[PDB]
Amino acid sequence: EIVLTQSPGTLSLSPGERATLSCRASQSVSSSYLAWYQQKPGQAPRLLIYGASSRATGIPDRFSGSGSGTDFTLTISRLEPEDFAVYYCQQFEFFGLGSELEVHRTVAAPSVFIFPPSDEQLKSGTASVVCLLNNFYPREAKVQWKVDNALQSGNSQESVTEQDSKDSTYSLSSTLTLSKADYEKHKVYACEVTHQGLSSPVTKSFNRGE
């Protein structure tokens, strides 16, 4: 049961810098049968390195790898715009969970918006409230729903866009699912945002029937 553990999980860097990804095996393994892969969103993985050292046919000279026994590394110099993806580590059947290369950017604050349920949707018997966060960095953010003033949990789903190509920001949208009965039993609906770019948590709310 050879277990490959690769770290760090997330690495935020700027173009032109150095990148190091370590893949540590649980027990000693043979260096002649290791591989490094790269996978971008929507595509199949690319083979980068085979045997821990040798580079696959067609990959540039800025990719290199080494190691033996437990620990193996992958080093990439001169980061390009297309080198931000996920990198996997493989040894026969066993794989690694992965490591992500993120674009680094100055801290940005999310513009918070909210939208009350539509009059059309309230005919079906279910109400939905949506909270919107626009162009923020880093990706880590927490959105908490507050019907009236009670913290809601278990009735929300979130979607996060991938990092932008130009400004390298993120966008998040959380939804709230309540029935027509539960929606008409309350007045105030709020979704507060906690982000390191906000000096204090920002709360946007509205009042039902107003």
Binding site: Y33, A44, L47, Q90, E93, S118, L132, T161, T175
Partner: protein, 220 residues
């Protein structure tokens, strides 16, 4: 010029049996082993097994032992894999791969890959989307969008003014609801002053239901 082409996306109910194909192009089909790899939607890679096309011999992973059978067709260049007794956690992308150009780097460092076959395992039926608007509110700019709720299966395309607006648009990935139907929202940031004059229209298209919808977005 080695090329591997797979089957299209398929949707099946738990317990059924899905078969996906993988056609070779630029090499002797029987000369190299053919592997199969599964990748969950949010997770990583998982190895299923290989089939030697020259003899038909197989070797499956311990997890799929007794649930999967890999066949081949030498007349064509297609290698098949069939996963029986499906359940919900089998929903993933299924790739077929092939070892590299070297000799003794192993049969597992795969240099050539297929395009992948999406397989969704669910008990739901085909349902069309329901589009609801998101009305703008009161500083320097305002945001608005439309919400696509309750549709199956994925995907749907969302555009604005019939593809006349690109900057500011943000189409989020879908979320699987407990009812089995997906849902997503798509928004756009616009100047707060052009709110009363410029008209904004949502465009939703769901092919599995053959449903084309244009929706009006206006402040209530």
């Amino acid at each position: 010029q080695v090329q591997l082409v797979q089957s299209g996306a398929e949707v099946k109910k738990p317990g059924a049996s899905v078969k996906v194909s993988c056609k070779a192009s630029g090499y002797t089909f029987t000369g190299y082993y053919m592997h199969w790899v599964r990748q969950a939607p949010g997770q990583g890679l998982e190895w299923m097994g290989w089939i030697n096309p020259n003899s038909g011999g197989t070797n499956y992973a311990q997890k799929f032992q007794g649930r999967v059978t890999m066949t081949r067709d030498t007349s064509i260049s297609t290698a098949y894999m069939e996963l029986s007794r499906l359940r919900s956690d089998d929903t993933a992308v299924y790739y077929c791969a092939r070892r590299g150009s070297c000799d003794y780097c192993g049969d597992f460092p795969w240099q050539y890959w297929g395009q992948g076959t999406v397989v969704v395992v669910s008990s739901a039926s085909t349902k069309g989307p329901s589009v609801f608007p998101l009305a703008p509110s009161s500083g320097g700019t305002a945001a608005l969008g439309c919400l696509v709720k309750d549709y199956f299966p994925e995907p749907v395309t969302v555009s604005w003014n019939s593809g006349a607006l690109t900057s500011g648009v943000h189409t989020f990935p879908a979320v699987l609801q407990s009812s089995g139907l997906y849902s997503l929202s798509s928004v756009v940031t616009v100047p707060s002053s052009s709110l009363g004059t410029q008209t904004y229209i949502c465009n939703v298209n769901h092919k599995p239901s053959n449903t084309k919808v244009d929706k009006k977005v206006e402040p209530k």
